Amino acid sequence: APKVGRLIYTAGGYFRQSLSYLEAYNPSDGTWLRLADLQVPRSGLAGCVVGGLLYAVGGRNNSPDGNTDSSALDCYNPMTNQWSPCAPMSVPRNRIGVGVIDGHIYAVGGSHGCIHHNSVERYEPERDEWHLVAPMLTRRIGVGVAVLNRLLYAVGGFDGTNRLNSAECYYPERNEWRMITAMNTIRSGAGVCVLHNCIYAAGGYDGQDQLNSVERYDVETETWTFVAPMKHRRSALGITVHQGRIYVLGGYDGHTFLDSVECYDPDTDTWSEVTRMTSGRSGVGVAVTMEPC
Ligand SMILES: Cc1ccc([C@H](CC(=O)O)NC(=O)Cc2ccc3c(c2)CCCC3)cc1
């Protein structure tokens, strides 16, 4: 699984307005590279990687003139430093969550104006087609999504009335969603990822304050356990895993748009500041793939 020359890509984001940046961080030497801008600015999107290609999914273009929720799927090839449009999703999805099962991209929840989706759809890259699958049991915007052992988890979010501590799991062979144990803490816009045999939920927003607490769901024991908290409270953060460590990027803490990137080491249960982004921003999409050539 580990290979040399992989970077942490951050796409889009929000600061005053939705952003077009694509920038890549190299943990091996601490450098940032600025790459090809997104064709359309977008915040509240999600990123993922299939077959060494980076995908930017959903979001919203919050611009000086208006707010346009995105149904777009766009693909970045590091070999060419170019974005290519793909088939669009069935519906615009801002504040989206995304996960990949066996090379297929799942787009989960999100908002379209005042509409809060429980719908879910699945993208087939070779066929360039989206199709709807079973909807979630709960409408979730700002939902955290991660895949472990070819099961897809949807964690927290906002249903239009309450921020959520609930979570649920999608079982592909049954096309069926089931509730799992609820988190200890209500979290909207948390960073959600997979590390070892646990689903981590870092930070988020409870309608009052941004959070620095982090908790992980053990898919075997079905319990949520707090780990060491992040140094900086944040919601609408980006998150990814690289070489056995969690990286959180940016977000909003109620006072500033963070540029800080923290790295969690599960062997020592400690966070450390590893770098800063080129500028503070929230609502980014993040994924890991090979460096451009
Ligand atoms: C991508 C995403 C995911 C979840 C959320 C949730 C959605 C909810 O619970 O209302 N909200 C937050 O976290 C709070 C927040 C986050 C970013 C910003 C602000 C407020 C205000 C200033 C602009 C930036 C927002 C965005």
Structure token digits, residue 224? 């949520």
Taken in order 180, 186, 189, 192, is the CA torsion positive or negative? Answer: negative
Of 95, 110, 12, give the one whose Cα is nearest residue 54: 12
Structure token digits, residue 72? 């777009």
Of 196, 229, 214, 209, give the one whose Cα is nearest residue 155: 214
Check if the beta carbon of residue 262 is closer than 8 Å to that of residue 231. Answer: yes
Question: Please, which residues bridge with residue 17 across strands?
Answer: 15
Which residue has tokens 């949520």?
Answer: 224
- How much distance in Å is there from the Cα of 43 to the middle of ligand 1? 11
Quickly count: other Cβ atoms within 10 Å of residue 157's Cβ. Answer: 34
Which residue has tokens 């099962």?
Answer: 101
- How much distance in Å is there from the Cα of 248 to the middle of ligand 1? 16
Resolution for this experimental structure (Å): 1.8
The Cα–Cα gap between 136 and 2 comes to: 33
Structure token digits, residue 5? 């020359």
- How much distance in Å is there from the Cα of 236 to the middle of ligand 1? 6
Closest protein CA for atom 5 of ligand 1: 189
The Cα–Cα gap between 135 and 263 comes to: 33
List the determination method. Answer: X-ray
The Cα–Cα gap between 161 and 292 comes to: 43
The Cα–Cα gap between 291 and 102 comes to: 22
DSSP secondary structure, the chain, as one string? ---SSEEEEEE--EESEE---EEEEETTTTEEEE-PPPSS--BS-EEEEETTEEEEE--EEE-SS-EEE---EEEEETTTTEEEE-PPPSS--BS-EEEEETTEEEEE--EETTEE---EEEEETTTTEEEE-PPPSS--BS-EEEEETTEEEEEEEE-SS-EEEEEEEEEGGGTEEEEEPPPSS--BS-EEEEETTEEEEE--B-SS-B---EEEEETTTTEEEEEPPPSS--BS-EEEEETTEEEEE--B-SS-B--EEEEEETTTTEEEEEEE-SS--BS-EEEEEEPP-
Which residue has tokens 């209500």?
Answer: 186
Domain segments of the chain as ranges: 1-293
**Is the shortest distance between the CB of 158 and ligand 1 below 6 Å?**
yes
Check if the beta carbon of residue 225 is closer than 8 Å to that of residue 216. Answer: yes
The Cα–Cα gap between 238 and 181 comes to: 24
Closest protein CA for atom 19 of ligand 1: 252
